[PDB]
Amino acid sequence: ADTPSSPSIDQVEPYSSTAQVQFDEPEATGGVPILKYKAEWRAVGEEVWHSKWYDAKEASMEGIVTIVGLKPETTYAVRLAALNGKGLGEISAASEFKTQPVREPSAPKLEGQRGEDGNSIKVNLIKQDDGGSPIRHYLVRYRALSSEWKPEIRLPSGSDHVMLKSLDWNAEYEVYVVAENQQGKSKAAHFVFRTAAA
Amino acid sequence: ADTPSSPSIDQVEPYSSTAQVQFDEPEATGGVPILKYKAEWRAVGEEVWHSKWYDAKEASMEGIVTIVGLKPETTYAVRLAALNGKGLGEISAASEFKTQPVREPSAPKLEGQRGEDGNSIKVNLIKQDDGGSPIRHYLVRYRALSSEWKPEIRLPSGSDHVMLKSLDWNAEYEVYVVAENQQGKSKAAHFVFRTAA
């Protein structure tokens, strides 16, 4: 019959463009189960508050609710409210945070695996911290030691591996993989291998 | 009329115990809409996959789905599936990633504000990276310059400010605030000020 009491904010882990808000359910539900959570955030200096609804069942099974699309290095204020059949409840105290800056991506971990034949190798990618911004491409470079670099390969962020077929036999190669985002390139992850004799 | 194809993972941002997965949805085939997305993850080396459902609509507006309850410094494989009225589509290929290690928290930023009376001040906290693990406490310490440290105050993580009242008038003070999690304490943030006459 009543509206919910305020949710309580426990954590606010800020990232570059997203922020994870950890909270506790309201002490009082008002008499009707909590259906959704209204998140409100505002850039320090703005008047209007941005909002978004979150499903109560999913929110509680996660313990968190992630607000997205924020600007890096900005001070924000964020608060919550619970909505039940009767209506919207009292809003929480406004927690304040500042988002992190976008940094270059860290290097990916590389894992070698056998390819179809002895003169080929498959390099599996193990993703790493991207710096706070989506990864644009993966730049792969390789060569047979003491020899020229084959043409550089560009890979989509979603790529999980890179195959290097039709190589020279009984030859030693080195592969360089770099992760790149809107901010720049990462340190290169190198990997060295040797094809079979025949 | 059938189940949808597999989604496509475009990004996986790993943190310490969570990971943000970005992806492309499949075509909505079969005349019916996509209802949910199934996220599956397994620490590389295990056999049993974990899982969680994500409302399709919410995911589509968010742009990501966040898997939680992961262990730090661990290699995981994640894959996604799309659900619709006719049933669960095919899982996507595994995407591997490694969670970050847990670090100490970063110090919080302090901002001063007037208090109820001229002999008090309100110290607002501007929260910051917690090092990948929940903040346990906010250790605060203040004092009038050229005197001993007042007793330490322990603020719970949900605190947004520290109020210092019943201070001497026309006196100079400084505040020290440290954020602390399981990993340890951060470097302290300072704030010096002077009460009114």
Author numbering:
A (entry chain A): 497 to 694
B (entry chain B): 497 to 693
Report text from the authors:
The neural cell adhesion molecule (NCAM) is the prototype and founding member of the immunoglobulin (Ig) superfamily cell adhesion molecules (CAMs). NCAM is present on the cell surface of neurons, astrocytes and oligodendrocytes, where it mediates homophilic and heterophilic cell adhesion. NCAM is involved in neuronal migration, axon growth and guidance, as well as in synaptic plasticity associated with learning and memory. We conclude that the NCAM–FGFR1 interaction at the cell surface may be transient or stabilised by avidity effects resulting from receptor clustering and that conformational changes within NCAM may have a profound role in FGFR1 activation.
When examined by size-exclusion chromatography, all three mutants eluted as a mixture of monomers and dimers, similar to the wild-type protein (data not shown). We obtained crystals of the M610R mutant and determined its structure at 2.7-Å resolution by molecular replacement. The relative orientation of the two FN3 domains in the M610R mutant is less severely bent than in the wild-type structure but still far from fully extended (interdomain angle ∼ 120°). There is no domain interface to speak of in the mutant (240 Å2 buried), and the conformation appears to be stabilised entirely by the crystal lattice. The conformation of multidomain proteins often is influenced by the crystal lattice. The neuroglian tandem, which has an extensive domain interface that incorporates a bound sodium ion, adopts a conformation that is intermediate between the two conformations we report for the NCAM tandem.
